[PDB]
Amino acid sequence: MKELIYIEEPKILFAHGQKCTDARDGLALFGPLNNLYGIKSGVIGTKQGLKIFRDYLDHIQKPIYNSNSITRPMFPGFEAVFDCKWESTGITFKEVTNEDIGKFLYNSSTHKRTYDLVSLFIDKIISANKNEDENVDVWFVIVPDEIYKYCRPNSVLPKEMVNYDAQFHDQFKARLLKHTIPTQIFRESTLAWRDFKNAFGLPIRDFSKIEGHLAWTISTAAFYKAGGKPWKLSDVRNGVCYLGLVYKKVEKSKNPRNACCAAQMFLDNGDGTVFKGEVGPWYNPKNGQYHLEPKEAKALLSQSLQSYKEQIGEYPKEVFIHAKTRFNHQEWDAFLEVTPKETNLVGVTISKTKPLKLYKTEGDYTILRGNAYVVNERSAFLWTVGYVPKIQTALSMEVPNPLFIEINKGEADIKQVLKDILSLTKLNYNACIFADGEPVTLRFADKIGEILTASTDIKTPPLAFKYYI
Amino acid sequence: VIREDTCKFLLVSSSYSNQREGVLKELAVAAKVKKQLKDDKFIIPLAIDEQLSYDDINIDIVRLNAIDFKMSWARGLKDILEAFEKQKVPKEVADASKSN
Amino acid sequence: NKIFISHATPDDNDFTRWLALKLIGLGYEVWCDILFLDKGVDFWSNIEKVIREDTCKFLLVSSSYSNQREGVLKELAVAAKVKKQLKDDKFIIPLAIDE
Amino acid sequence: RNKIFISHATPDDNDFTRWLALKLIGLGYEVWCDILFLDKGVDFWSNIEK
DNA sequence: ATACAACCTACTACCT
Ligand SMILES: [Mg+2]
């Protein structure tokens, strides 16, 4: 009968140098680190979409409550939290006609339909960015639910109503990377869930008990997209750089390729957390192989080390490479040929496939979050999802799944690796929640990869995450 | 504490607190101290409930100038701080460590 | 269907007693704070309830003592709100008694 | 007797009233306005009358 | 090209 080890919950940092575990509570009490003056919003869509967005923007300012304010904290309003203005008066409208949407919506080919709709929105975006004298921080694209339903890669258009990825969101964000415009895509049913009902006279999506959670998530995403920093890590060490590598399949070309994207996190001399991407997805011409060539591995590590040195002044002491795959010998030897003697290379594999479930004997709740089961000096299990005493509820749904964290290559302390991963799980800026399951490096590398492998014509993409997430 | 300690009496005005017995007792005690202390602005109602109309506030409050928290809490807190600095309400140096 | 008379309690007692008794003798329901020998625990709450739910007219004894009396002014404000609610222009009828 | 009283519809004439009050204060005139000088938690009608 | 084990990704569907 085996033993477990507990890893303390990490604390994130907020305004006035105040540490907390919950992002929502820390934002409510102290506030963001940045001082944005206000958010100027550009809205694209039909007149109904503009009305929906204006109504939601007016609704945001007033406090919003949930069914339980212990499990899910309430939203006290946008300005009361972020201390900046995001009002409906600063809205810039670029109308898209319903007739124009219907002209391209009902087409035989899903590729042609999604390309036409994506181009219809992007043409207005770029025309307003270039030929209009007003400044817009974030562009909010209100999308009718038909466009969402009928633009999926595998979606089929009913016969009665009859490169680049066949997906509205990824192709939309991939074709806007040349102009560096942060965009937030909304569905009309998200902000007006009450007005869309099913055959039984009830809404399809019920946000009655989680209205404040929706407000939290939307407001945090909008604040991050406008150039604000809501929080940052507090316990991360100096001289260590975290890398996260994700491979994606590219079906745009005739020959399948495995594009590898990365995410890089570290600490600058100003105590600010530098978290960005690592792009120019290094491809592999062999189908089914998710291992980098020596040349591409050398290029990746050289670029990462050069970026770290430029931002700091010296090469990192430690480098951690979180990947969902296992590095092989040739790729690791290629990696080691770039690192200097002072830089220690550690390659960690993070997976969620191993089926180990721990059931509490005498309760209706689940295993505590932060528990670990160190298999051996190079392998452990980490429970990043589970019961959180602070919110008196579990992040998982039925029984949480563990993360099998294994130090595949290099020498490092396994407990330190688990602590680093559990601290990374607090850096998700796409959502305003308690810490999620996967580390932020792998998740954001996946988010980058899902967009960079949509459109082929991306020479040098930006590094900021507001253009991807 | 109402009689000997407080310099300002903030009252959260809502539909629940409009006719609550304990809140009314505290309001009566605060009114007594306000008359004793010759302080015209001892009681400050903060209107936070949109349901409770301005025509339904209780008799001890219907004459006072309230702070509107209905539309925005940030504006209400700005008004509270502006009144506190204008009325020379005693305060120490700001410190988030106490709140934490 | 009551008639509320607002006055300074110890100063305008003669005229208030005279008018209240005269109105009672003429067939009106008069609510005055001097027409209750024993006072209950809830006075101000009961006064506001009477003004909001019972009275149809609000006679104000306008004198020098009742000009700036806190209780009279509070009742006046509540009566103004009630008059606005009932859409009656002549709900409040002041009585000038002081030279 | 130095104050200058400005009467207006409180939530509808706010812009012009604020503009005029700030201007008149600019040239050294003492101005009393309910949107800039009326205290909080005070008997506002008695204060206005006084 | 068949059998297996040990790893890998892509694309939905439902809950709150
Ligand atoms: Mg997002």
Side-chain angles (χ1 to χ4, degrees), chain B residues 40-41 43-44 63-67 79 86-87, chain D residues 34 36-46:
Chain B
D40 213 322
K41 314 150 209 106
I43 306 181
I44 301 184
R63 299 262 308 171
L64 302 188
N65 201 18
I67 306 192
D79 287 358
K86 180 184 296 186
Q87 299 164 15
Chain D
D34 82 280
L36 308 180
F37 302 90
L38 189 63
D39 279 300
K40 300 283 179 164
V42 89
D43 203 14
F44 54 96
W45 271 128
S46 142

PDB file of all heavy atoms in Angstrom, chain B residues 40-41 43-44 63-67 79 86-87, chain D residues 34 36-46:
ATOM      1  N   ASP B  40     -24.260  66.751  10.938  1.00  0.00           N
ATOM      2  CA  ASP B  40     -25.352  66.670   9.976  1.00  0.00           C
ATOM      3  C   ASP B  40     -25.210  65.469   9.049  1.00  0.00           C
ATOM      4  O   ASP B  40     -26.217  64.954   8.548  1.00  0.00           O
ATOM      5  CB  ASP B  40     -25.425  67.960   9.160  1.00  0.00           C
ATOM      6  CG  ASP B  40     -26.842  68.320   8.764  1.00  0.00           C
ATOM      7  OD1 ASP B  40     -27.625  67.400   8.448  1.00  0.00           O
ATOM      8  OD2 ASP B  40     -27.172  69.524   8.767  1.00  0.00           O
ATOM      9  N   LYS B  41     -23.986  65.008   8.810  1.00  0.00           N
ATOM     10  CA  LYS B  41     -23.711  63.947   7.850  1.00  0.00           C
ATOM     11  C   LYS B  41     -23.166  62.704   8.543  1.00  0.00           C
ATOM     12  O   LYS B  41     -22.225  62.066   8.066  1.00  0.00           O
ATOM     13  CB  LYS B  41     -22.746  64.433   6.773  1.00  0.00           C
ATOM     14  CG  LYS B  41     -23.092  65.799   6.211  1.00  0.00           C
ATOM     15  CD  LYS B  41     -21.851  66.534   5.750  1.00  0.00           C
ATOM     16  CE  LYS B  41     -22.032  68.035   5.868  1.00  0.00           C
ATOM     17  NZ  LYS B  41     -21.260  68.589   7.014  1.00  0.00           N
ATOM     18  N   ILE B  43     -25.050  59.890   9.212  1.00  0.00           N
ATOM     19  CA  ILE B  43     -25.652  58.730   8.564  1.00  0.00           C
ATOM     20  C   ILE B  43     -25.563  58.922   7.058  1.00  0.00           C
ATOM     21  O   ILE B  43     -26.031  59.933   6.522  1.00  0.00           O
ATOM     22  CB  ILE B  43     -27.111  58.532   9.005  1.00  0.00           C
ATOM     23  CG1 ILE B  43     -27.203  58.459  10.529  1.00  0.00           C
ATOM     24  CG2 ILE B  43     -27.690  57.275   8.374  1.00  0.00           C
ATOM     25  CD1 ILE B  43     -28.604  58.231  11.038  1.00  0.00           C
ATOM     26  N   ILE B  44     -24.967  57.950   6.374  1.00  0.00           N
ATOM     27  CA  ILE B  44     -24.828  57.987   4.921  1.00  0.00           C
ATOM     28  C   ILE B  44     -25.447  56.721   4.341  1.00  0.00           C
ATOM     29  O   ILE B  44     -24.919  55.619   4.552  1.00  0.00           O
ATOM     30  CB  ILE B  44     -23.356  58.129   4.503  1.00  0.00           C
ATOM     31  CG1 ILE B  44     -22.755  59.407   5.091  1.00  0.00           C
ATOM     32  CG2 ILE B  44     -23.234  58.129   2.990  1.00  0.00           C
ATOM     33  CD1 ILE B  44     -21.332  59.667   4.656  1.00  0.00           C
ATOM     34  N   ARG B  63     -35.046  61.446   3.828  1.00  0.00           N
ATOM     35  CA  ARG B  63     -34.630  62.839   3.734  1.00  0.00           C
ATOM     36  C   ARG B  63     -33.144  63.018   3.448  1.00  0.00           C
ATOM     37  O   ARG B  63     -32.709  64.152   3.226  1.00  0.00           O
ATOM     38  CB  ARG B  63     -34.974  63.588   5.028  1.00  0.00           C
ATOM     39  CG  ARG B  63     -36.450  63.625   5.360  1.00  0.00           C
ATOM     40  CD  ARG B  63     -37.071  64.938   4.922  1.00  0.00           C
ATOM     41  NE  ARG B  63     -36.346  66.100   5.418  1.00  0.00           N
ATOM     42  CZ  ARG B  63     -36.589  67.347   5.039  1.00  0.00           C
ATOM     43  NH1 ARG B  63     -37.538  67.627   4.160  1.00  0.00           N
ATOM     44  NH2 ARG B  63     -35.864  68.335   5.551  1.00  0.00           N
ATOM     45  N   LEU B  64     -32.362  61.944   3.440  1.00  0.00           N
ATOM     46  CA  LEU B  64     -30.913  62.040   3.342  1.00  0.00           C
ATOM     47  C   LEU B  64     -30.440  61.857   1.905  1.00  0.00           C
ATOM     48  O   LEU B  64     -31.087  61.190   1.094  1.00  0.00           O
ATOM     49  CB  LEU B  64     -30.240  61.001   4.239  1.00  0.00           C
ATOM     50  CG  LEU B  64     -30.575  61.067   5.729  1.00  0.00           C
ATOM     51  CD1 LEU B  64     -29.702  60.106   6.513  1.00  0.00           C
ATOM     52  CD2 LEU B  64     -30.411  62.482   6.246  1.00  0.00           C
ATOM     53  N   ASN B  65     -29.289  62.458   1.604  1.00  0.00           N
ATOM     54  CA  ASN B  65     -28.666  62.329   0.293  1.00  0.00           C
ATOM     55  C   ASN B  65     -27.907  61.010   0.223  1.00  0.00           C
ATOM     56  O   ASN B  65     -26.947  60.799   0.971  1.00  0.00           O
ATOM     57  CB  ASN B  65     -27.730  63.508   0.037  1.00  0.00           C
ATOM     58  CG  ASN B  65     -27.452  63.723  -1.436  1.00  0.00           C
ATOM     59  OD1 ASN B  65     -28.188  63.240  -2.294  1.00  0.00           O
ATOM     60  ND2 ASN B  65     -26.386  64.455  -1.735  1.00  0.00           N
ATOM     61  N   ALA B  66     -28.332  60.127  -0.673  1.00  0.00           N
ATOM     62  CA  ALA B  66     -27.778  58.786  -0.779  1.00  0.00           C
ATOM     63  C   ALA B  66     -26.703  58.720  -1.857  1.00  0.00           C
ATOM     64  O   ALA B  66     -26.594  59.595  -2.719  1.00  0.00           O
ATOM     65  CB  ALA B  66     -28.880  57.769  -1.080  1.00  0.00           C
ATOM     66  N   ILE B  67     -25.908  57.656  -1.795  1.00  0.00           N
ATOM     67  CA  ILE B  67     -24.867  57.371  -2.775  1.00  0.00           C
ATOM     68  C   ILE B  67     -25.354  56.233  -3.660  1.00  0.00           C
ATOM     69  O   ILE B  67     -25.767  55.181  -3.157  1.00  0.00           O
ATOM     70  CB  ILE B  67     -23.533  57.017  -2.098  1.00  0.00           C
ATOM     71  CG1 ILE B  67     -23.130  58.123  -1.121  1.00  0.00           C
ATOM     72  CG2 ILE B  67     -22.448  56.804  -3.139  1.00  0.00           C
ATOM     73  CD1 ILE B  67     -21.711  58.018  -0.616  1.00  0.00           C
ATOM     74  N   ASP B  79     -17.335  57.988  -5.032  1.00  0.00           N
ATOM     75  CA  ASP B  79     -18.122  58.976  -4.298  1.00  0.00           C
ATOM     76  C   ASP B  79     -17.887  58.867  -2.796  1.00  0.00           C
ATOM     77  O   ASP B  79     -17.790  59.884  -2.100  1.00  0.00           O
ATOM     78  CB  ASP B  79     -19.605  58.808  -4.620  1.00  0.00           C
ATOM     79  CG  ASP B  79     -19.956  59.287  -6.012  1.00  0.00           C
ATOM     80  OD1 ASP B  79     -19.054  59.790  -6.713  1.00  0.00           O
ATOM     81  OD2 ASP B  79     -21.135  59.164  -6.407  1.00  0.00           O
ATOM     82  N   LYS B  86     -13.551  64.923   1.693  1.00  0.00           N
ATOM     83  CA  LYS B  86     -14.164  66.241   1.816  1.00  0.00           C
ATOM     84  C   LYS B  86     -14.600  66.532   3.248  1.00  0.00           C
ATOM     85  O   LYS B  86     -14.523  67.681   3.696  1.00  0.00           O
ATOM     86  CB  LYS B  86     -15.354  66.358   0.865  1.00  0.00           C
ATOM     87  CG  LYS B  86     -16.065  67.700   0.918  1.00  0.00           C
ATOM     88  CD  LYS B  86     -17.289  67.721   0.022  1.00  0.00           C
ATOM     89  CE  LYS B  86     -16.907  67.556  -1.439  1.00  0.00           C
ATOM     90  NZ  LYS B  86     -18.081  67.714  -2.340  1.00  0.00           N
ATOM     91  N   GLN B  87     -15.047  65.514   3.978  1.00  0.00           N
ATOM     92  CA  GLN B  87     -15.534  65.681   5.340  1.00  0.00           C
ATOM     93  C   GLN B  87     -14.463  65.409   6.391  1.00  0.00           C
ATOM     94  O   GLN B  87     -14.783  65.366   7.584  1.00  0.00           O
ATOM     95  CB  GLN B  87     -16.749  64.781   5.575  1.00  0.00           C
ATOM     96  CG  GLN B  87     -17.924  65.096   4.661  1.00  0.00           C
ATOM     97  CD  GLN B  87     -18.955  63.987   4.625  1.00  0.00           C
ATOM     98  OE1 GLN B  87     -18.952  63.094   5.470  1.00  0.00           O
ATOM     99  NE2 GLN B  87     -19.844  64.039   3.642  1.00  0.00           N
TER     100      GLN B  87
ATOM    101  N   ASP D  34     -25.767  71.633  -7.058  1.00  0.00           N
ATOM    102  CA  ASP D  34     -26.110  70.394  -6.374  1.00  0.00           C
ATOM    103  C   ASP D  34     -25.291  69.207  -6.863  1.00  0.00           C
ATOM    104  O   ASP D  34     -25.174  68.213  -6.141  1.00  0.00           O
ATOM    105  CB  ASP D  34     -27.600  70.101  -6.538  1.00  0.00           C
ATOM    106  CG  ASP D  34     -27.920  69.446  -7.863  1.00  0.00           C
ATOM    107  OD1 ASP D  34     -28.002  70.169  -8.879  1.00  0.00           O
ATOM    108  OD2 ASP D  34     -28.090  68.211  -7.892  1.00  0.00           O
ATOM    109  N   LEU D  36     -22.031  69.394  -7.619  1.00  0.00           N
ATOM    110  CA  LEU D  36     -20.639  69.578  -7.230  1.00  0.00           C
ATOM    111  C   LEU D  36     -20.442  69.956  -5.771  1.00  0.00           C
ATOM    112  O   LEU D  36     -19.338  69.748  -5.251  1.00  0.00           O
ATOM    113  CB  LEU D  36     -19.971  70.652  -8.102  1.00  0.00           C
ATOM    114  CG  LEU D  36     -20.083  70.521  -9.622  1.00  0.00           C
ATOM    115  CD1 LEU D  36     -19.356  71.666 -10.302  1.00  0.00           C
ATOM    116  CD2 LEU D  36     -19.526  69.188 -10.092  1.00  0.00           C
ATOM    117  N   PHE D  37     -21.455  70.497  -5.091  1.00  0.00           N
ATOM    118  CA  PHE D  37     -21.288  70.991  -3.733  1.00  0.00           C
ATOM    119  C   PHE D  37     -22.291  70.424  -2.739  1.00  0.00           C
ATOM    120  O   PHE D  37     -22.195  70.739  -1.548  1.00  0.00           O
ATOM    121  CB  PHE D  37     -21.368  72.525  -3.712  1.00  0.00           C
ATOM    122  CG  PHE D  37     -20.352  73.194  -4.592  1.00  0.00           C
ATOM    123  CD1 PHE D  37     -20.641  73.480  -5.915  1.00  0.00           C
ATOM    124  CD2 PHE D  37     -19.103  73.530  -4.098  1.00  0.00           C
ATOM    125  CE1 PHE D  37     -19.707  74.090  -6.727  1.00  0.00           C
ATOM    126  CE2 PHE D  37     -18.166  74.142  -4.906  1.00  0.00           C
ATOM    127  CZ  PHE D  37     -18.469  74.422  -6.221  1.00  0.00           C
ATOM    128  N   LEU D  38     -23.242  69.606  -3.180  1.00  0.00           N
ATOM    129  CA  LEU D  38     -24.191  68.981  -2.266  1.00  0.00           C
ATOM    130  C   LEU D  38     -23.536  67.768  -1.619  1.00  0.00           C
ATOM    131  O   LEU D  38     -23.109  66.840  -2.314  1.00  0.00           O
ATOM    132  CB  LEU D  38     -25.466  68.584  -3.004  1.00  0.00           C
ATOM    133  CG  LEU D  38     -26.642  68.120  -2.141  1.00  0.00           C
ATOM    134  CD1 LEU D  38     -27.118  69.236  -1.229  1.00  0.00           C
ATOM    135  CD2 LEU D  38     -27.779  67.626  -3.018  1.00  0.00           C
ATOM    136  N   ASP D  39     -23.459  67.776  -0.290  1.00  0.00           N
ATOM    137  CA  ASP D  39     -22.772  66.720   0.433  1.00  0.00           C
ATOM    138  C   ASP D  39     -23.595  65.433   0.415  1.00  0.00           C
ATOM    139  O   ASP D  39     -24.776  65.416   0.058  1.00  0.00           O
ATOM    140  CB  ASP D  39     -22.493  67.153   1.870  1.00  0.00           C
ATOM    141  CG  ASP D  39     -21.270  68.037   1.983  1.00  0.00           C
ATOM    142  OD1 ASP D  39     -20.168  67.576   1.618  1.00  0.00           O
ATOM    143  OD2 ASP D  39     -21.410  69.192   2.432  1.00  0.00           O
ATOM    144  N   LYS D  40     -22.948  64.342   0.811  1.00  0.00           N
ATOM    145  CA  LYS D  40     -23.583  63.035   0.872  1.00  0.00           C
ATOM    146  C   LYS D  40     -24.018  62.742   2.301  1.00  0.00           C
ATOM    147  O   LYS D  40     -23.334  63.112   3.259  1.00  0.00           O
ATOM    148  CB  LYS D  40     -22.638  61.940   0.375  1.00  0.00           C
ATOM    149  CG  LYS D  40     -22.173  62.128  -1.059  1.00  0.00           C
ATOM    150  CD  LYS D  40     -23.254  61.721  -2.044  1.00  0.00           C
ATOM    151  CE  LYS D  40     -22.802  61.927  -3.479  1.00  0.00           C
ATOM    152  NZ  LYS D  40     -23.674  61.195  -4.440  1.00  0.00           N
ATOM    153  N   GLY D  41     -25.161  62.078   2.437  1.00  0.00           N
ATOM    154  CA  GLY D  41     -25.726  61.817   3.749  1.00  0.00           C
ATOM    155  C   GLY D  41     -26.180  63.067   4.471  1.00  0.00           C
ATOM    156  O   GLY D  41     -25.993  63.180   5.688  1.00  0.00           O
ATOM    157  N   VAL D  42     -26.778  64.013   3.746  1.00  0.00           N
ATOM    158  CA  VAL D  42     -27.241  65.270   4.314  1.00  0.00           C
ATOM    159  C   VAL D  42     -28.690  65.489   3.904  1.00  0.00           C
ATOM    160  O   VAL D  42     -29.174  64.931   2.916  1.00  0.00           O
ATOM    161  CB  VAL D  42     -26.361  66.465   3.874  1.00  0.00           C
ATOM    162  CG1 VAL D  42     -26.877  67.075   2.577  1.00  0.00           C
ATOM    163  CG2 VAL D  42     -26.296  67.515   4.972  1.00  0.00           C
ATOM    164  N   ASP D  43     -29.389  66.301   4.691  1.00  0.00           N
ATOM    165  CA  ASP D  43     -30.749  66.715   4.355  1.00  0.00           C
ATOM    166  C   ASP D  43     -30.666  67.714   3.211  1.00  0.00           C
ATOM    167  O   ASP D  43     -30.452  68.908   3.424  1.00  0.00           O
ATOM    168  CB  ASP D  43     -31.440  67.317   5.572  1.00  0.00           C
ATOM    169  CG  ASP D  43     -32.950  67.255   5.472  1.00  0.00           C
ATOM    170  OD1 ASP D  43     -33.456  66.523   4.600  1.00  0.00           O
ATOM    171  OD2 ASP D  43     -33.630  67.934   6.270  1.00  0.00           O
ATOM    172  N   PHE D  44     -30.842  67.228   1.979  1.00  0.00           N
ATOM    173  CA  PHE D  44     -30.502  68.044   0.819  1.00  0.00           C
ATOM    174  C   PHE D  44     -31.510  69.160   0.578  1.00  0.00           C
ATOM    175  O   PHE D  44     -31.128  70.235   0.106  1.00  0.00           O
ATOM    176  CB  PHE D  44     -30.356  67.169  -0.429  1.00  0.00           C
ATOM    177  CG  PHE D  44     -31.542  66.293  -0.710  1.00  0.00           C
ATOM    178  CD1 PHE D  44     -32.518  66.697  -1.604  1.00  0.00           C
ATOM    179  CD2 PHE D  44     -31.669  65.056  -0.104  1.00  0.00           C
ATOM    180  CE1 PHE D  44     -33.605  65.890  -1.874  1.00  0.00           C
ATOM    181  CE2 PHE D  44     -32.754  64.246  -0.369  1.00  0.00           C
ATOM    182  CZ  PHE D  44     -33.723  64.664  -1.255  1.00  0.00           C
ATOM    183  N   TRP D  45     -32.787  68.945   0.898  1.00  0.00           N
ATOM    184  CA  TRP D  45     -33.767  70.004   0.678  1.00  0.00           C
ATOM    185  C   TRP D  45     -33.600  71.135   1.685  1.00  0.00           C
ATOM    186  O   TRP D  45     -33.654  72.314   1.316  1.00  0.00           O
ATOM    187  CB  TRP D  45     -35.185  69.439   0.730  1.00  0.00           C
ATOM    188  CG  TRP D  45     -35.675  68.960  -0.602  1.00  0.00           C
ATOM    189  CD1 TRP D  45     -36.209  67.738  -0.885  1.00  0.00           C
ATOM    190  CD2 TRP D  45     -35.675  69.693  -1.834  1.00  0.00           C
ATOM    191  NE1 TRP D  45     -36.539  67.663  -2.215  1.00  0.00           N
ATOM    192  CE2 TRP D  45     -36.223  68.850  -2.820  1.00  0.00           C
ATOM    193  CE3 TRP D  45     -35.267  70.981  -2.201  1.00  0.00           C
ATOM    194  CZ2 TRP D  45     -36.372  69.250  -4.145  1.00  0.00           C
ATOM    195  CZ3 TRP D  45     -35.415  71.374  -3.515  1.00  0.00           C
ATOM    196  CH2 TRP D  45     -35.962  70.513  -4.470  1.00  0.00           C
ATOM    197  N   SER D  46     -33.382  70.797   2.957  1.00  0.00           N
ATOM    198  CA  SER D  46     -33.108  71.825   3.954  1.00  0.00           C
ATOM    199  C   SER D  46     -31.813  72.559   3.640  1.00  0.00           C
ATOM    200  O   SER D  46     -31.730  73.783   3.795  1.00  0.00           O
ATOM    201  CB  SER D  46     -33.048  71.202   5.347  1.00  0.00           C
ATOM    202  OG  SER D  46     -32.031  71.804   6.128  1.00  0.00           O
TER     203      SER D  46
END
